[PDB]
Amino acid sequence: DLDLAKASATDQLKKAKAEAQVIIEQANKRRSQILDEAKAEAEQERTKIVAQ
Amino acid sequence: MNLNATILGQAIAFVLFVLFCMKYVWPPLMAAIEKRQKEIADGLASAERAHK
Secondary structure, three states: OHHHHHHHHHHHHHHHHHHHHHHHHHHHHHHHHHHHHHHHHHHHHHHHHHHO | OOOOOHHHHHHHHHHHHHHHHHHHHHHHHHHHHHHHHHHHHHHHHHHHHHHO
């Protein structure tokens, strides 16, 4: 039982420690995409203003 | 029945079997039994500690 709990411990930390970063990476990726849209649109509406 | 000097000879035989027993017989046997008991107690104690 002492053998088994150690193995489970190591494996569970293996999952959790990395998955925190994979979700944070998904967060950062969507951040980058959203900022791409934001800057593109903030530029694009200058066209409407100048034509106005 | 009839009291005898034997009550005195037997007091020698008695005391001597108590000293040799007290020194050699009892201490090692109790040592071995306690050595088994401690091992099983503390082994399982370690088992329930790691489980939590």
